[PDB]
Amino acid sequence: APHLVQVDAARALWPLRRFWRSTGFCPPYVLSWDQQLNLAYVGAVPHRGIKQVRTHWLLELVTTLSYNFTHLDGYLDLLRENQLLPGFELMGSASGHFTDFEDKQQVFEWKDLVSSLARRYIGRYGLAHVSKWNFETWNEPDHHDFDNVSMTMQGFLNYYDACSEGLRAASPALRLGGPGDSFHTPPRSPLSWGLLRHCHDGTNFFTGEAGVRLDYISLHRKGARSSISILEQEKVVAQQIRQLFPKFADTPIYNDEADPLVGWSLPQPWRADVTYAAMVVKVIAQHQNLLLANTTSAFPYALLSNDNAFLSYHPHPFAQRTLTARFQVNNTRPPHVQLLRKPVLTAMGLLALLDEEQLWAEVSQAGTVLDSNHTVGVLASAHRPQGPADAWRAAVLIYASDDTRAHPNRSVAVTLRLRGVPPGPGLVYVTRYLDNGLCSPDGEWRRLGRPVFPTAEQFRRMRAAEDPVAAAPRPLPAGGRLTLRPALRLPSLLLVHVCARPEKPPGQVTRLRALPLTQGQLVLVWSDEHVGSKCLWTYEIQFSQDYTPVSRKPSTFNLFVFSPDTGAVSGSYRVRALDYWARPGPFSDPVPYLE
Ligand SMILES: *[C@@H]1O[C@H](CO)[C@@H](O[C@@H]2O[C@H](CO)[C@@H](O[C@@H]3O[C@H](CO[C@H]4O[C@H](CO)[C@@H](O)[C@H](O)[C@@H]4O)[C@@H](O)[C@H](O[C@H]4O[C@H](CO)[C@@H](O)[C@H](O)[C@@H]4O)[C@@H]3O)[C@H](O)[C@H]2NC(C)=O)[C@H](O)[C@H]1NC(C)=O
Ligand SMILES: *[C@@H]1O[C@H](CO)[C@@H](O[C@@H]2O[C@H](CO)[C@@H](O)[C@H](O)[C@H]2NC(C)=O)[C@H](O)[C@H]1NC(C)=O
Ligand SMILES: *[C@@H]1O[C@H](CO)[C@@H](O)[C@H](O)[C@H]1NC(C)=O
Ligand SMILES: [Cl-]
């Protein structure tokens, strides 16, 4: 019996927030060319699909009473250039200065450091930008990862008050949360539970007032290979917080390390391809449909982050918990680094097309209704037109996922019945499909024989599997209805995108950049902020030597590796958007490049 999926486009039930637009990593580097390419890939996810990079040890990029912020300036400028925000963990010793947060003088000094850095980047980027940053406490305070810093229970409370008063001294508009740990049953997790008590009922180190600001509560809960287990654990902790700390009943909860499995560097075949991608989507659907979609308990769940911005290493380029797959090519003159886009990163681009209202949807099999706690599920959104540059849109994202298990032998019959699409001009739909057969760079790597130092040709062949199989825009049937019967594989993802025609064509592509990889090989990366519509077929790239169109298969990811057979890359480049009705947007400013 096939899976039946119905979507009611006429039933916009409630807001749908893109709560999953976060990644993160821990340095072992942050200014290396490897990292610069990595963050270019992360920022290239369309429509701000990844917004935050939660980065450990940021205050080891400051040296020491005056401070040198050079290395921190560099990293934060790097994020800014890629339209990314720091998940700013106030974590580090300022290169050995801080050693003890029960030393009164050190507590005052920490406050002044935090004030200085906060005011510095307010000056550097503006208060409007810095007020969006999730400042956070030291990572996992109950896992004793403090190097040479003494952090007792009392020290952690003093530290927190310095963090909070230091940020306030910069501006009251800045946001601070924590503890970013797992909240195990007492007597476990004493610093986590202690922080909440302190903020709820304790005394401020600096002011002596009862209670201390806490803008959000961050936890870490990982699935041990189970998707639904993440959600189950979060509900337990959230309820405990609600009853034990009534003032925090409406305090936003973050799970900013919500991964399928602990230990990012452990090689796992399922991390290499669409298995991981589909599980990530499944976890997100479970959170929207079983936690946020008008549940009786209604916990204030606000953010979910997959901690997968790490760079992979030899001999596991694809098998680690990373958005990209790194190849250090050591036999070129000089040695260079290349990155590939893993399906999980591509999947963040499909998620990014989900809009601000959730539509009514039901999955069933043989009359039995199945919620997102099953192998097949759906998230469906609608968009209210903003101006002449956009129109009505619907995005239906369907996953087939058995968590960390793939099933190459199996095929999942699915019948999608879309109903109630509101009438409008040039209504078309476009399907985007991912599975391990057609669109897995790891799979291509292995068909090529697993080359350790891939050639230019081998990279082209691997990159040819990055994008989803996209079907050309077809007119929507009459009555605002669409019935499709795809044969989904396990794992797979299917995005059906139904768009009405906007009045104006797409806007201008902006902030084009050329980044060198090696001889005759280069990355083109751009912003899509002013494009003004999500209904895009591809981005046309043109190259001039004295402009001709660079021929490539369709892709809406804001990054392209140009690697021509001739090796001629010197000249000027320009890029523009192309919508589902073949209408071009204006060209970006031309970017020159000389090799
Ligand atoms: C081409 O050239 C590049 C640049 O020179 C080489 O890059 C090195 O690659 C190796 C992997 O082959 C890297 O070494 C590995 O680093 C891992 C992470 O290290 C950090 O984290 C650990 C643990 O937290 C710390 O101990 C460590 O100090 C670092 O902070 C380690 O996990 C690896 O060790 C594990 O595997 C080895 C097997 O070799 C076991 O012996 C160990 O017990 C352990 O299980 C490993 O050390 C290295 O960091 C890379 N250097 C750089 C600068 O990037 C490429 O290897 C080379 N390519 C080829 C094909 O030769
Ligand atoms: C998700 O579904 C699983 C089953 O697939 C649920 O786990 C079962 O829970 C019941 C409790 O009524 C137990 O009796 C069973 O032993 C469990 N079965 C298995 C296979 O583990 C789980 O409770 C569901 N979770 C949510 C949040 O709906
Ligand atoms: C700060 O550190 C940078 C990087 O190490 C170095 O180049 C510079 O000399 C330092 N600046 C000052 C003012 O000490
Ligand atoms: Cl994982």
Resolution (A): 2.1
Q: Which ligand is nearest to the CA of 63?
A: 3
Please tell me whether the peptide bond between 491 and the residue prior to it is cis, using omega within 30 degrees of 0.
Answer: yes
Q: Taking the domain 1-16+356-503, which CATH number applies?
A: 2.60.40.1500
Cα–Cα distance, 451 to 455 (Å, whole number): 8
Residue among 29, 264, 314 whose CB has most ligand 1 atoms within 8 A, to mutate: 314
Nearest CA residue ID for atom 10, ligand 3: 68
Is the CB of residue 417 less than 8 Å from the CB of residue 363?
Answer: no
Q: Which ligand is nearest to the CA of 373?
A: 2
- DSSP H or E run through 413: strand 407-419
CATH 2.60.40.1500 in the chain, residue ranges:
1-16+356-503
Cα–Cα distance, 256 to 224 (Å, whole number): 16
Q: Could you tell me the CA-to-CA distances from 142 to 24, 208, 216, 242, 297 in Å, in that order?
A: 19, 26, 18, 21, 28
**CA 477 centroid distance within chain:** 34
Is the CB of residue 558 less than 8 Å from the CB of residue 539?
Answer: yes
State the number of CA atoms in the 13 A half-sphere of 395 facing the CB. Answer: 21
Please tell me whether the peptide bond between 179 and the residue prior to it is cis, using omega within 30 degrees of 0.
Answer: yes
Q: Please, what CATH class does the domain formed by 17-355 belong to? A: alpha beta
Pocket around ligand 1 at a 6 A CB cut-off: 28, 313-314, 328, 330, 452
Q: Is the CB of 68 under 6 A from ligand 3?
A: yes
Q: Spot the catalytic one: 140, 165, 466, 540.
A: 140
- Tokens of residue 453, six digits: 């130092």
Q: Is 558 within any annotated ligand binding site?
A: no
Cα–Cα distance, 256 to 397 (Å, whole number): 23
What sign does the dihedral 17-181-165-52 (CA atoms) show? negative
Residue length of the chain = 595
Is the CB of residue 133 less than 8 Å from the CB of residue 84?
Answer: no
**CA 408 centroid distance within chain:** 27
Nearest CA residue ID for atom 3, ligand 2: 373
Q: Please, what CATH class does the domain formed by 504-595 belong to? A: mainly beta
Cα–Cα distance, 23 to 50 (Å, whole number): 7
**CA 592 centroid distance within chain:** 30
Last residue before each break in the chain (C–N > 2.5 Å) = 28, 64, 546
- Beta-bridged to residue 400, according to DSSP, are 376, 492
Q: Is 143 within any annotated ligand binding site?
A: no
Q: Is 461 within any annotated ligand binding site?
A: no
Q: Give the type of residue at 514.
A: A
Nearest CA residue ID for atom 24, ligand 2: 373
- Indicate which atom in ligand 1 lies nearest the CA of residue 265: 32
Cα–Cα distance, 485 to 340 (Å, whole number): 32
Q: Is the CB of 330 under 6 A from ligand 3?
A: no
Residues 6 or more apart whose CB falls under 8 angstroms from that of 128 comprise none
Residue 56 CA to ligand 1 centre (angstroms): 20
Residues 6 or more apart whose CB falls under 8 angstroms from that of 378 comprise 5, 7, 285, 361, 363, 396, 397, 398, 399
Is the CB of residue 431 less than 8 Å from the CB of residue 494?
Answer: yes
Q: Considering only CA atoms, which of 327, 227, 340 is closest in space to residue 275? A: 227
Label each residue of 426-477 as H, E or C: CCEEEEEEEECCCCCHHHHHHHCCCCCCCCHHHHHHHHCCCCCEECCCEECC
- Indicate which atom in ligand 2 lies nearest the CA of residue 290: 27
Residue 68 CA to ligand 2 centre (angstroms): 54
CATH 3.20.20.80 in the chain, residue ranges:
17-355
- Tokens of residue 312, six digits: 């992979």
Q: Is the CB of 370 under 6 A from ligand 2?
A: no
- Indicate which atom in ligand 1 lies nearest the CA of residue 452: 60
* Residue 140 among the catalytic residues: yes
Cα–Cα distance, 81 to 67 (Å, whole number): 24
Q: Considering only CA atoms, which of 470, 240, 278 is closest in space to residue 377? A: 278
Cα–Cα distance, 174 to 176 (Å, whole number): 7
Cα–Cα distance, 218 to 302 (Å, whole number): 10
Cα–Cα distance, 463 to 450 (Å, whole number): 14
Cα–Cα distance, 520 to 85 (Å, whole number): 32
Cα–Cα distance, 448 to 458 (Å, whole number): 7
Q: Give the type of residue at 33.
A: W
User: Helix (H, G, I), strand (E, B), or coil: what is residue 187?
Assistant: coil
3-state helix, strand, coil in the chain (%, to 5): 25, 30, 45
Residue 100 CA to ligand 3 centre (angstroms): 26
Cα–Cα distance, 281 to 258 (Å, whole number): 12
Q: Is the CB of 203 under 6 A from ligand 2?
A: no
Q: Considering only CA atoms, which of 589, 562, 588 is closest in space to residue 506? A: 588
End-to-end CA distance of the chain: 59
Cα–Cα distance, 328 to 313 (Å, whole number): 8
CATH 2.60.40.10 in the chain, residue ranges:
504-595
User: Helix (H, G, I), strand (E, B), or coil: what is residue 351?
Assistant: helix
Strands 407-419 and 482-484: antiparallel
Ranges assigned E (strand) in 222-272: 253-255
- Indicate which atom in ligand 1 lies nearest the CA of residue 313: 11
Is the CB of residue 256 less than 8 Å from the CB of residue 275?
Answer: no
Residues 6 or more apart whose CB falls under 8 angstroms from that of 217 comprise 177, 178, 179, 196, 241, 248, 251, 252, 253, 254
Is the CB of residue 23 less than 8 Å from the CB of residue 309?
Answer: yes
Q: Is 446 within any annotated ligand binding site?
A: yes
Strands 52-55 and 22-25: parallel
Residue written as token pair 């991390």: 271
User: Helix (H, G, I), strand (E, B), or coil: what is residue 95?
Assistant: coil
